[PDB]
Design an enzyme around this catalytic site. Sequence first.
Site, short mmCIF file in Angstrom:
data_model
loop_
_atom_site.label_atom_id
_atom_site.label_comp_id
_atom_site.label_asym_id
_atom_site.label_seq_id
_atom_site.Cartn_x
_atom_site.Cartn_y
_atom_site.Cartn_z
N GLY A 182 -7.79 6.37 17.24
CA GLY A 182 -8.49 7.31 16.29
C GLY A 182 -9.25 6.65 15.14
O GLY A 182 -9.14 5.43 14.89
N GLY A 230 -10.56 5.56 11.33
CA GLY A 230 -10.00 5.23 10.01
C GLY A 230 -11.05 5.52 8.95
O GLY A 230 -12.10 6.07 9.25
N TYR A 289 -14.12 4.86 7.25
CA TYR A 289 -15.35 4.06 7.49
C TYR A 289 -15.18 2.99 8.62
O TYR A 289 -15.78 1.90 8.56
CB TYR A 289 -15.81 3.38 6.19
CG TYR A 289 -15.63 4.24 4.95
CD1 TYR A 289 -16.46 5.33 4.67
CD2 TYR A 289 -14.58 3.98 4.08
CE1 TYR A 289 -16.24 6.12 3.51
CE2 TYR A 289 -14.36 4.72 2.96
CZ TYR A 289 -15.16 5.79 2.66
OH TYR A 289 -14.78 6.46 1.48
N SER A 344 -13.00 2.51 12.85
CA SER A 344 -12.11 3.02 13.85
C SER A 344 -10.97 2.06 14.12
O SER A 344 -11.05 0.85 13.81
CB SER A 344 -12.88 3.41 15.08
OG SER A 344 -13.23 2.27 15.83
N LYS A 397 -8.35 -2.22 12.50
CA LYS A 397 -9.50 -1.42 12.09
C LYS A 397 -10.73 -2.27 12.01
O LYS A 397 -10.78 -3.24 11.24
CB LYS A 397 -9.29 -0.68 10.73
CG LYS A 397 -10.55 0.16 10.34
CD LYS A 397 -10.38 1.27 9.25
CE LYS A 397 -10.17 0.77 7.85
NZ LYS A 397 -10.32 1.79 6.75
N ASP A 456 -5.35 4.54 2.79
CA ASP A 456 -6.64 5.07 2.29
C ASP A 456 -6.60 5.39 0.78
O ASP A 456 -7.18 6.33 0.36
CB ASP A 456 -7.10 6.26 3.17
CG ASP A 456 -7.54 5.83 4.59
OD1 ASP A 456 -7.58 4.62 4.88
OD2 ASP A 456 -7.83 6.70 5.46
N1 SB4 Z 1 -1.65 3.72 13.90
C1 SB4 Z 1 -1.99 3.16 12.76
N2 SB4 Z 1 -1.11 2.31 12.18
C2 SB4 Z 1 -1.45 1.72 10.98
C3 SB4 Z 1 -2.67 2.03 10.37
C4 SB4 Z 1 -3.56 2.91 10.99
C5 SB4 Z 1 -4.75 3.23 10.38
C6 SB4 Z 1 -5.58 2.54 9.55
C7 SB4 Z 1 -5.59 1.22 9.24
C8 SB4 Z 1 -5.88 0.83 7.95
C9 SB4 Z 1 -5.94 -0.51 7.61
C10 SB4 Z 1 -5.72 -1.50 8.59
F1 SB4 Z 1 -5.79 -2.81 8.20
C11 SB4 Z 1 -5.48 -1.13 9.89
C12 SB4 Z 1 -5.43 0.23 10.23
N3 SB4 Z 1 -6.60 3.34 9.13
C13 SB4 Z 1 -6.35 4.55 9.62
N4 SB4 Z 1 -5.20 4.50 10.35
C14 SB4 Z 1 -4.59 5.65 11.09
C15 SB4 Z 1 -3.95 6.69 10.21
C16 SB4 Z 1 -4.46 8.09 10.59
N5 SB4 Z 1 -4.39 8.30 12.06
C17 SB4 Z 1 -4.89 7.15 12.84
C18 SB4 Z 1 -5.62 6.28 11.91
N6 SB4 Z 1 -3.19 3.44 12.18
#
Ligand code: SB4
Lengths: 351, 18
Positions: free
Chosen positions: A29, A31, A33, A35, A51, A166
Amino acid sequence: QERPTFYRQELNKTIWEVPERYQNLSPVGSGAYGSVCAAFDTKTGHRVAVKKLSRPFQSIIHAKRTYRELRLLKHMKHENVIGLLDVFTPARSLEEFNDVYLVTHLMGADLNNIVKCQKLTDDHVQFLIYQILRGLKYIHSADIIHRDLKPSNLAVNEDCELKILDFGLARHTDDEMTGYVATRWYRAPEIMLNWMHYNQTVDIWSVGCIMAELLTGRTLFPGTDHIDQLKLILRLVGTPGAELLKKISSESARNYIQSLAQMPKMNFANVFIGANPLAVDLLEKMLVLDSDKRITAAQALAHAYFAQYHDPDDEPVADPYDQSFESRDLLIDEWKSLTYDEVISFVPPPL
Amino acid sequence: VYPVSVPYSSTLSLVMPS
Ligand SMILES: Nc1nccc(-c2c(-c3ccc(F)cc3)ncn2C2CCNCC2)n1
């Protein structure tokens, strides 16, 4: 430390070029700005989230925000806040630097997913709100406000552990603000229209909203617009005095509220039927209109609802964060160069 | 009125949606 070996593949319609340490990439899914893909990391043995930023340097505002996000993620070292396991770029020089990839531990879901698929017990709510507040004490100690706390921004796993993500990224003058609909539902009244007067307890309002929703399964104040939202809020907390009402309303909304009879305060114990009396009591300290009387993260943690978890010597504050960059005015390539410096200077966790 | 999901009576896990 030499450059790792990278490999390429196509995910979410771009080429993801990553170190070979990251395997089995799986899109999970969007993130902020960017994905996100889930992966296994051969190096730590953890499942991680990677991400990739979407056009990180496409304007000055985007470039700065890319910088802001990287600086924030690098600073946060706290069990209930997303931090960085890794940050990388396939670029070998500033002259080829285009993409930023951020890595943290994999969390299985977000609280939106949980609330929409499963009933939570009072014990779940205790531990979840406790972690939010623990994380928030730490964020607030670095003179950062989250500004957008909602369920989708709270990451969770199978053992009911939680991390805030976030934080502190968006500003209210940003265009095509994604998530704006859901963000309204959780936002403190005082910043619903302008941000000329607010403090860090705007985040505690959002926590109150989230907590109510974890308890009941239902969004507390799902307004359709600024007037509707205010009406929904006042229906619960009661119509305040004229000076306070002016601080939280537009003239239009104020006029709509005043075209209706004064709303009395509801007793929260008669709204949240079946709840833990202590859960009700803390909600009463969080969902208050006067932001100078709204409880802080530190104070909330000592509330008796958190007796089973609360510990002052294990609820840490942050090292001081340098936000001097926020006052700067730089061109795309200058924010880029600064962001590059930060990618190259990154030092990973020991493990 | 917003009755709680699970009425209060005087280790934790969560199930993932998938
Ligand atoms: N499954 C999961 N686990 C940890 C983080 C995230 C993540 C991040 C994110 C942020 C920083 C980073 F360095 C790596 C990932 N940004 C949005 N999301 C998820 C949180 C909302 N649903 C899926 C997106 N997703």
